[PDB]
Design a protein around this ligand. Sequence first.
Ligand SMILES: CCc1c(C(=O)NCc2c(O)ccc3cccc(O)c23)[nH]c(C)c1C(C)=O
Length: 116
Amino acid sequence: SMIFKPEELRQALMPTLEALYRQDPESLPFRQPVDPQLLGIPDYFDIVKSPMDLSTIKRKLDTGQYQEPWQYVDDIWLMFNNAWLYNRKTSRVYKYCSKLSEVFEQEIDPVMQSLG
Ligand SMILES: CCc1c(C(=O)NCc2c(O)ccc3cccc(O)c23)[nH]c(C)c1C(C)=O
């Protein structure tokens, strides 16, 4: 497979993460890991087996933990899928998740094309 350097991936992908951080208030529940004790949802880790959030993804981009860009896409999707799984379909966080996913779908496609 074709190699991707960490600096190359950060430069290309960080603007798509920025697009999510720019969604205010919609990104706010996603900017830090879910804390089930604080949020009063003790069953969270029983339902969501692989937690993910924007701060974790940003750290991985910053430190160079992605070898290829689809690994980043996978983490973004994991974050969305967790929220759609756990939260009720009429809930604020479910709706915020849907908004972030719409933004991501629009931003990510030209970026992935350029990476090749
Ligand atoms: C519903 C708890 C939850 C949060 C969260 O952090 N809620 C608290 C929150 C904020 O941390 C910041 C702004 C909020 C603005 C509105 C409603 C909220 O609740 C907000 N984030 C995720 C991914 C979940 C679940 C379970 O999937």
